[PDB]
């Protein structure tokens, strides 16, 4: 139970101190296509 | 656990003295010098 407790603050610590580590479902590459009109809750396309 | 620690101070020791044996998989083949192109995020022959 205390393992899970220390694991909760592990997330909130590591994402600040070590930093970075932003989360979301997206596509990394610089230079994109267009629009976001359907988008949400998909895996694979919508567009590039 | 201390045997695993011996393996940590093995890699850190042996690679400096004995050295060599650097491969990308089981071959070190192709890419020459440097490459700076990448594509999307996927790495083909490229920087492979």
Swiss-Prot record, chains A, B:
Domain of life assignment: Viruses
Transmembrane segments: none
Localization, UniProt: Virion
Subunit details: Homododecamer. Interacts with the terminase large subunit; this interaction allows the packaging of viral DNA. Interacts (via C-terminus) with the head-to-tail adapter protein gp4; this interaction participates in the head completion. Interacts with the scaffolding protein; this interaction initiates procapsid assembly, thereby ensuring incorporation of only one portal ring per capsid. Interacts with the capsid protein.
Similarity comment: family membership: Belongs to the p22likevirus portal protein family.
Function recorded in the entry: Forms the portal vertex of the capsid. This portal plays critical roles in head assembly, genome packaging, neck/tail attachment, and genome ejection. Procapsid assembly may initiate with a nucleation complex composed of portal and scaffolding proteins. The portal protein multimerizes as a single ring-shaped homododecamer arranged around a central channel. Switches upon genome packaging from an asymmetrical conformation in the procapsid (PC-portal) to a symmetrical ring in the mature capsid (MV-portal). This change of conformation may serve as a signal for headful packaging.
Full protein name: Portal protein
Taxonomic source organism: Salmonella phage P22 (Bacteriophage P22)
